[PDB]
Design an enzyme around this catalytic site. Structure first.
Site, mmCIF file in Angstrom:
data_model
loop_
_atom_site.group_PDB
_atom_site.id
_atom_site.type_symbol
_atom_site.label_atom_id
_atom_site.label_comp_id
_atom_site.label_asym_id
_atom_site.label_seq_id
_atom_site.Cartn_x
_atom_site.Cartn_y
_atom_site.Cartn_z
ATOM 1 N N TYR A 214 0.852 -1.194 0.000
ATOM 2 C CA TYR A 214 0.000 0.000 0.000
ATOM 3 C C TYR A 214 0.891 1.250 0.000
ATOM 4 O O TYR A 214 1.605 1.506 0.960
ATOM 5 C CB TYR A 214 -0.963 -0.073 1.197
ATOM 6 C CG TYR A 214 -1.777 1.164 1.560
ATOM 7 C CD1 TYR A 214 -2.133 2.130 0.620
ATOM 8 C CD2 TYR A 214 -2.228 1.341 2.876
ATOM 9 C CE1 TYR A 214 -2.903 3.253 0.995
ATOM 10 C CE2 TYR A 214 -2.989 2.460 3.253
ATOM 11 C CZ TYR A 214 -3.321 3.396 2.316
ATOM 12 O OH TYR A 214 -4.080 4.467 2.714
ATOM 13 N N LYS B 231 -2.097 -1.738 -3.426
ATOM 14 C CA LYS B 231 -3.048 -0.643 -3.419
ATOM 15 C C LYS B 231 -2.197 0.570 -3.781
ATOM 16 O O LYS B 231 -1.354 1.001 -2.990
ATOM 17 C CB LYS B 231 -3.690 -0.482 -2.035
ATOM 18 C CG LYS B 231 -4.757 0.623 -1.913
ATOM 19 C CD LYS B 231 -5.254 0.827 -0.453
ATOM 20 C CE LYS B 231 -6.088 2.113 -0.286
ATOM 21 N NZ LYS B 231 -6.742 2.293 1.072
#
Lengths: 292, 292, 292, 292
Positions: free
Chosen positions: C133, C161
């Site tokens: 992420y 992400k």
């Protein structure tokens, strides 16, 4: 044409810094034979900034005559004074160019209203098709999507060279314009991404030295074969990046000379000759592309 | 000469965009009486971008004539092509101006070596003192301290208008140059800070309308009286920010007109008339400074 | 699941700032019924930053129990100390979560080598699938594509992400990873663009309040009907933007309360209650989306 | 107390990452003998990010004990959750520390109003003096001058470590706060500039290895002897830049070890050992400063 690979052609020069007719002809034959869809004459890569308007016009006309109807020619017409943009544009009315590439005023940082009035007045003083050209890192200002949508309602204004490298702009502009409005990348390294998002082509620096690959990349792109387009893009990616290792067009003029396309890689100050380390870097990218 | 409050004077225009001699005369008389150190003629605030070189030269000569020896005049001579800058400079030989303010080439984004060669060649072909002018927000390039140091060894390059607003540059430049080399802020809002760090003055937009306060502020600064200078700067700070609420020189021209110093606030496209919101914001800044 | 619309679910709280079991259950039923593909529990939108690790774990377990096998649950496991990331991850080993969302260390700005060692050590201390992420604006550091490619060779590390909003990253990462590596947008406003470039879905804030639209947008996207997906996206675009009018999750918690999905919009300091002007702005975006 | 050269002291570690008492004692004796004004214990340079609060507290108490009243100690007490910052602060009541250095919440990106409430509540629940700490590059938010002015009215909030490197903040803050409110640079390379504009000192990384030079430089600065301070600053400038060639405190810990001041240069993940290139770059900066 306003689709596929459009070359922002170098203005090849002799050692005195004046246009070299033989080198230019050689380039134009090359793009004719390579499938290049159009030539932008005296754009940024053509050193618009260091040619006066007479020399600018001479190169455009020479380019048009040498093209000899075999390949459309778009004239760079940008100026940061609106009256000067109109006047430069007027030199090409009834000339044979298919359209104009016109940049947001640089240096004086107009407001979005200023940009609207600038391009609207230009479009009203010509019948020629107008391609807007946004490049904030050079100009100091940013023609936002909202303003492009507003300018697209002018019949004469028909597309944009979007050179931010910011891909969100493709669909923000597309929402606000008709399906006839042409979206062109002005950033070689992101141009395939740009076309995948719905862009229709690219006004390209890389196409100066890899014209066949680029024409074939954009054809594959427009047919929806994006995976196949990428294989070409990866081959071209070192070139996409390293042609800006030194300020454009220093690297691409050197590359042109190395490939025998032009006689000299001479530029006008304040652009300087490529550094030793720059040659090695560009040579290697050309090798990667399978050209040298 | 090249210290103190130097005004980047507006080029006042009539409704049709042509220089207004009577208003220009009013401004020059106002600077002579308000203690301004010098006038920069046809700088950025003077709409260098939208006057052709012939009009640029006329405005400078008219400024010289109207000044009539009472105040020194520095001409803007910036161009993004080296041969064009040399050639514009030549128009001011034996003219009466005391110096030239010459900007880093805009749009073409040259390397540091390119900027060195650009300014070195300009300096070589005149006897006039040269003040370098760095403003990346407008140009797309940034003349770093190391390169300022090289250029300062040229007998003829005597100072810099540093308009970044990045105050670390003052002492980075100062330690690389002789004690005679002049450092002038080109950013009104950080100009007192700039002088307090070792700067010698400011080339100023605010000075167009607050000439007296500006002259006193820069004198106090040079005497080391920074607290007394700050009090003046606090009352001018709204003007320092809000003269850039809309593109310069749109707000300052409107302010000159509100004060009665110029007949019209007309600019040339792509600059546009001030909006109503900008009108109110600038009038509030004028009242804060005690001018209305 | 690691495809389609994944919700970064709010941690609904009572007025004391503790998790509200009834509001959470209502949200989880809503995403079950709406076609949401997965829940990220105690991500950024879940206020990972203001819950201690015990409270974090309690919310994850509660979420998992309420999901009751009807919808996969991904646990947020980010920490800026690697030893703390391992320890937080270990709380969920053999728990029922399908995987972990783990952020680049924030504040201490590790090098790319530091990021490699951080995520590699985390992956080696768990059997759970790991979604990287990247969110530089929050963390102060940027997990570049080269490093993601390196980390993808870890069997356990299976996706990213990507919350930069920088769409060029989709294909730069894709070149360096296998076709099994999942690419998820972390930026609602660009997520459809992201998926058009080859992304497989989105971990979304907007999906908290428009779960049906978002699930249907990503389904259309994955089937190649991008024009139809856009109609939904334009409906959702005010929400995409205005849910960050104030710092996330302030706007989305208010929106949840307005839609009757949660009992209170309470947050933990330093997050503050939505401003009056924020309510009006978010209310209007909800109206635009056809929800209020 | 809170002026002069304040060191952001490293937390020296053994091979396993645990605090090394003997090396910490060496550092503290070195600061007492070198004229350092105070020690910040477990700041950013002290690896606040990777010590749990129990280890953080131990290092602070050990620093207090070793200092043995010879030098004041300020504890880092920063947390991105308000209740967590309050609670960490409580661990230092009646401990002997003279103050707390408390950072803007990182990662969650609160509004200005959020930052006001964050710091106001911390200040309410202690008698200890609070020094605000702003460093957007690490946190993702920026505590603006206006908000510093509000917080300065709290009896208990006495100063700010401004680590932006943006020197305009000195006088923007100063004009909004009382004459007693302390302004300290958190950016070594611009720290002399900061003090010359009105700052009272620096919380410094460089001071870890150049304590004497730093103390003399800050004294001369406070006496207005800026030219004499600059000469010292010119020889420390390579260290000011190159202690951040790799993430802080990787280079400074290596430098402390090279000088013999700490037994090992071990950090905790995600900080990684210094690379060879960084080794050479930092050794060159040490020799420039006259330390090897």
């Amino acid at each position: 044409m306003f689709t596929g690979s459009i070359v922002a052609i170098v203005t090849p020069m002799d050692e005195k810094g004046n246009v070299c007719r033989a080198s230019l002809k050689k380039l134009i034959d090359y793009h004719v034979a390579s499938g290049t869809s159009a030539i932008v004459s005296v754009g940024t890569t053509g050193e618009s900034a260091t040619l006066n308007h007479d020399e600018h016009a001479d190169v455009v006309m020479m380019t048009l005559d040498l093209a000899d109807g075999r390949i459309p020619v778009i004239a760079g017409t940008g100026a940061n004074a609106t009256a000067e943009a109109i006047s430069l544009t007027q030199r090409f009315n009834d000339s044979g160019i298919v359209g104009c590439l016109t940049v947001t005023p640089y240096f004086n940082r107009p407001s979005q209203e200023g940009l609207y009035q600038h391009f609207k007045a230009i479009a009203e003083h010509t019948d020629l098709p107008q391609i807007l050209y946004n490049v904030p890192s050079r100009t100091g200002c940013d023609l936002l999507p909202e303003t492009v949508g507003r300018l697209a309602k002018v019949k004469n204004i028909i597309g944009i060279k979007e050179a931010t490298g910011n891909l969100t702009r493709v669909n923000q502009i597309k929402e606000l314009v008709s399906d006839d409005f042409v979206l062109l990348s002005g950033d070689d390294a992101s141009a395939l991404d740009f076309m995948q998002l719905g862009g229709h082509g690219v006004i390209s620096v890389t196409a100066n030295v890899a014209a066949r690959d680029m024409a074939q990349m954009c054809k594959l792109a427009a047919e929806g074969h994006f995976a196949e387009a990428r294989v070409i893009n990866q081959r071209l990616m070192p070139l996409h990046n390293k042609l800006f290792v030194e300020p454009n067009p220093i690297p691409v003029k050197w590359a042109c000379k190395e490939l025998g396309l032009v006689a000299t890689d001479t530029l006008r100050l304040p652009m300087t000759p490529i550094t030793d380390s720059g040659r090695e870097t560009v040579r290697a990218a050309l090798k990667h592309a399978g050209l040298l």
